[PDB]
């Protein structure tokens, strides 16, 4: 990883899922980058600025994925009233 004195060896330093932490592999054909555009006052979605989320594939397969995304959004501040802490 870090040879001798820094010198970062090992490229491809992976996307880790937002929900699970779980490393998203090179051929993780199912995993997805959601891009959510940055909001502004009175309309306006600010061109070229996002909250980007990575979702691993396992979660998607499960169907626990949407919920996770929602939770993430809530944590960030892209939603209100949606994802509760307790169910």
């Amino acid at each position: 990883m870090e040879n001798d004195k820094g010198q970062l060896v090992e490229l491809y330093v992976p996307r880790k899922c937002s929900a699970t932490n779980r490393i998203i592999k090179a051929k993780d054909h199912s995993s997805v980058q959601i891009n959510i555009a940055q909001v502004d006052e009175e309309g306006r979605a600010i061109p070229g600025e996002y909250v980007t989320y990575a979702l691993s594939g396992y979660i998607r397969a499960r169907g626990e994925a949407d919920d996770s995304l929602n939770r993430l959004a809530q944590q960030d501040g892209l939603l209100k009233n949606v994802w509760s802490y307790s169910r």
């Binding site: 870090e2 040879n3 491809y12 054909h29």
Partner: protein, 217 residues
């Protein structure tokens, strides 16, 4: 004679995706084959074996040829390609193409202590296919590729310089063994370490960024 379908392919042609590393990072599919070639000029393609293979018919049998091909370099990339066609050369070509399409990175780590450049696997990783479990245990330096011949070859192609194996179940189902090995290799990037606890930024993909250059006019 180039011409790409696939946004990714187009991007590659344009020359805004530099290396396959980026692709790996954004887990982008490579249905086209030429992209890989463009990226990596050092692809050594080695044919492992060719089984003749026969469907049985009302008269005689349908001889085809399941050619197994392993593709690599010494950077830390491998491809495994299996195809079964009737013309042998054609089949081989197909296999090669498949391997290229697959081509998958390998996390090469340190035996014990950093010191020089890394040419073993990072963690004890294993794979599985049918009844073959290839387990790749990281070696020390100079200790070589301790493996079944095909497995050894694969390792060489990858650019793993030293490694221990423990291929168990029916290893002589050669293709299966190879597949297992490939799986194990893949699992290297996927096994979380304390080196990767630290949080990354999530970069925008080339597909998102260079979206005007990709796609047809």
């Amino acid at each position: 004679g180039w011409v790409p379908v696939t946004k990714l392919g187009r991007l590659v042609k344009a020359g805004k995706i530099s290396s396959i590393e980026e692709i790996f990072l954004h887990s982008l599919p490579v249905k086209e084959f030429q992209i890989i070639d463009q990226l990596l000029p050092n692809l050594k393609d080695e044919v492992m074996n060719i089984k003749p293979v026969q469907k049985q018919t009302r008269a005689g049998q349908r001889t085809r040829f399941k050619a197994v091909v392993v593709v690599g370099d010494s950077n830390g990339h491998v491809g495994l390609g299996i195809k079964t066609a009737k013309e042998v050369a054609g089949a081989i070509r197909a296999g090669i193409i498949i391997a290229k399409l697959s081509v998958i990175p390998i996390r090469r780590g340190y035996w014990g202590t950093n010191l020089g450049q890394p040419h073993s696997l990072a963690t004890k990783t294993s794979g599985k296919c049918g009844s073959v479990s290839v387990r790749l245990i990281p070696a020390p330096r100079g200790s070589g590729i301790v493996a079944s011949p095909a497995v050894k070859k694969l390792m060489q192609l990858a650019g793993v310089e030293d490694v221990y194996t423990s291929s168990t179940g029916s290893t002589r189902t050669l293709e299966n063994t190879l597949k297992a090995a490939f799986v194990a290799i893949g699992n290297t990037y996927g096994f979380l370490t304390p080196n990767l606890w630290e949080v990354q930024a999530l970069t925008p993909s080339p597909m998102d960024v260079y979206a005007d250059y990709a796609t047809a006019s």
